[PDB]
Amino acid sequence: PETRPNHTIYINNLNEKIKKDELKKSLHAIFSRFGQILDILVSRSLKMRGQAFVIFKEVSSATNALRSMQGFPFYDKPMRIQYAKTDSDIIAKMK
RNA sequence: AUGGCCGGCAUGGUCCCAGCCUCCUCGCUGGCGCCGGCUGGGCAACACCAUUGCACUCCGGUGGUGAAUGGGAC
Ligand SMILES: [Sr+2]
Ligand SMILES: [Sr+2]
């Protein structure tokens, strides 16, 4: 099943050995160029490890980010990027 | 002494220097002889195992101390 365009991109296949704080910092280092980021959500729990949500202010940023960085080698692993299924809370609280 | 508790045995002492050791006051006002048994805390770090997982509620499991020695002064 495919996903529809979204403010938020969902990244998985991330290196699970990286600490939350550093992972957010690094993700920002490479994704900020695509547009203003509202937040980056990372959790190292059993269910949510290896994954991240990057919440852009504009959908065009998310879209550009998804196209350009698909398969990007990151901590020695190719990034897999999709649109999030649903809107992040940060986004609902505006639009 | 050890995260806490006990037993067998060995071993002259107090300082100074260097090297090493550790999940549980990484520190020079901790520790670094032999062997056996009992037991608590915690995944914070570290390691291993499992996990490819769509969140906006912090939240998988297991492991270790079964550790580390030389030199000088009195
Ligand atoms: Sr110790
Ligand atoms: Sr853990």
Author numbering: 4 to 98
What did the original publication write about this model?
The catalytic activity of the HDV ribozyme is essential for viral replication and viral particle assembly inside the host cells. In addition, residue C75 (C76 in the antigenomic ribozyme) is essential for the cleavage reaction, and mutating C75 to any other base, especially uracil or guanine, inhibits the reaction. In this study, we have used these new techniques to correct and improve the cleaved and the cis-acting C75U-inhibited structures of the HDV ribozyme, which were originally solved over a decade ago.
